[PDB]
Ligand binder design. Structure first.
Ligand SMILES: NC(=[NH2+])NCCC[C@H](N)C(=O)O
Ligand SMILES: NC(=[NH2+])NCCC[C@H](N)C(=O)O
Ligand SMILES: [Fe+2]
Ligand SMILES: [Fe+2]
Lengths: 341, 342
């Protein structure tokens, strides 16, 4: 480290036949299995996912395995703006048209080539595919439902079982609102700072949205919620981890701080923060664009924009993947279930 | 959630003639095209090539890792020609007389694709991704796959935090029907008192002798102590039961572990669990073409005493190990893509 800027993002452009094959496959699969989250689809996910165009499978497998580019941008998925229908005003509200579920299938199949798709009880009702869109009364939130600038972060950076890969699929983005991404492989940083960041001298806390639902889940249940405990008594942890010659990253400026009375930890963090800010790079998700982010090597944010709440607003589908679901067994209700409690 | 019945432990799958012959054809052509069972051309495209296997076998493997019901899967029916196989090598270092066994190595490597990430150890069989399990002269008394005395049951590489999630053993030759012993944590009768003690870091699990032999060599060559050596000298205290306490995972290796010194509760709880696993130990005989997939987080395995002749007719298995996440061992690997631990 550091590696060059061109190495960070790899672009794949699907041709017409590949795009058409995916459109046909995903509609047919939705028809047969009933839903993008269907148990019948999940039980057979690998098999169905290997009916996708071979070149996409190879690109996805390579991206995961070789660990070269930290972001994979796949463009060319057919998306019809009319058939898609208006953007829902809330993730809770069902869409006018069933069309967006076809593209949820695409996302769900893509996860098979990366690892185990999973969800959170404390986000969108434990759904395996999220809707990223603006929601009234959340304009000022640091979440996917805000309109104020979304500070860049590791996805669920606080949680030890946060995702390995984050998938964002553009469905509608008329105003070309960019997603910011910066890679730990591109960071210039002193050996002094790296060693401090590699020690457990930092407290990273859950974000507003997780806590909102954690509070009500502890009410409906008897027991306290692990997420609530992570806010109140966060365990000290490292920001850089893995192999020190090319480490992985765990960071969330808006919901973290160094240990108190630890100036070298604070200085190291601001030094790392400044670099990630410097190398922040815009990726505009157009309809059909899939962005695969290595959540162990990348931070991402999203620019401020103006929501209209009139059916034309920015709309993404989102899925998270863990390379090993079994490591979160103690936070799940049974071995096979994919939602963390 | 525990204990479960013995009937739930082992699931048998019998391949039919068409499935067997399709696998024989597939693995032969894969070997031809890719040049070796461990070839980088094969490994880079492994899931695509693995998905050319018969769909019922793919579904049985995928369900086995996802459902986590049965803790052992026995797939029978892989064609294995005893004559074309040629004589069992006298050591894993000796190349076999015939190239036939590498065809079955390919079956094994392909099977791993549906369970997770195949990996290896620098300190075992020179970092090979598929091992040979067979008796070697001078090692009759070893607690390894090369011994002929009773192999005490254990979690595979129990000492290591990045030990495998799944262990695959493929029978090639076993004329005298030597049984592989298996016992599952799901089937054990244990008190809550013992379970609590076993869930705390009050046990020291150390590497087996085979690991350390090679670690000592690699230490002198690289010019620094090997991680495995440190694990032998200063083992970090760890729990024998982990995961969810209602249906826990198991990490144990009696022949290479001890309870914390001066800890009689740890000593007693370990002895209780040990005696219970011993009572529930179940014989599975691997005949030619029998694949045994073991969940290493829920099962211990051993092997009965037998007599080796070292005349080319002795018991011979192929072996591979799978981790559900290769990335977690990054700090003990040379680079991100490298599949062999340092
Ligand atoms: N600083 C952060 N962690 N920002 C992202 C929060 C995203 C939020 N958990 C959501 O589901 O929309
Ligand atoms: N008690 C044990 N850990 N026994 C198994 C040792 C297996 C040995 N590492 C081998 O490669 O053959
Ligand atoms: Fe995010
Ligand atoms: Fe073993």
């Amino acid at each position: 480290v550091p590696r060059g800027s061109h190495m960070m993002i790899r672009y794949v452009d699907l041709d017409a036949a590949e795009g058409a094959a995916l459109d046909e496959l995903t509609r047919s699969v939705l028809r047969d299995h009933g839903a993008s989250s269907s148990p019948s689809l999940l039980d057979d996910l690998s098999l169905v996912a290997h009916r996708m165009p071979p070149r996409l499978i190879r690109e996805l497998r390579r991206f995961r395995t070789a660990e070269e580019a930290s972001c994979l941008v796949v463009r060319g998925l057919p998306v019809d703006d009319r058939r898609l229908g208006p953007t829902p005003l809330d993730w809770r509200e069902p869409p006018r048209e069933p069309e967006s579920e076809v593209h949820e299938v695409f996302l769900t199949l893509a996860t098979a080539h990366l690892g185990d798709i999973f969800g959170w009880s404390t986000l969108q009702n434990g759904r395996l595919v999220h809707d990223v869109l603006p929601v009234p009364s959340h304009e000022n939130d640091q979440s996917g439902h805000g309109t104020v600038e979304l500070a860049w972060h590791t996805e669920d950076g606080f949680h030890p079982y946060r995702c390995d890969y984050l998938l964002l699929l553009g469905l509608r983005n008329h105003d070309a609102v960019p997603t910011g991404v910066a890679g730990v492989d591109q960071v210039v940083l002193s050996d002094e700072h790296r060693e401090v960041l590699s020690q457990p001298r930092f407290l990273i806390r859950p974000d507003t949205e997780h806590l909102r639902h954690a509070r009500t889940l502890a009410a409906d249940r008897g027991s306290p919620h692990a997420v609530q405990l992570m806010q109140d008594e966060p365990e000290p942890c490292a920001v850089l981890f893995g192999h020190p010659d090319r480490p992985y990253l765990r960071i969330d400026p808006a919901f973290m701080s160094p240990l108190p009375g630890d100036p070298e930890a604070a200085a190291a963090l601001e030094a790392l923060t400044a670099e990630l800010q410097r190398n922040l790079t815009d990726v505009v998700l157009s309809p059909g664009d899939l962005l695969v982010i290595d959540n162990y090597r990348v931070v991402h944010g999203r620019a401020a924009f103006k929501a209209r709440f009139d059916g034309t607003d920015r709309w993404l589908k989102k899925a998270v993947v863990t390379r090993d679901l079994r490591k979160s067994r103690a936070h799940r209700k049974s071995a096979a279930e994919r939602v963390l409690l």
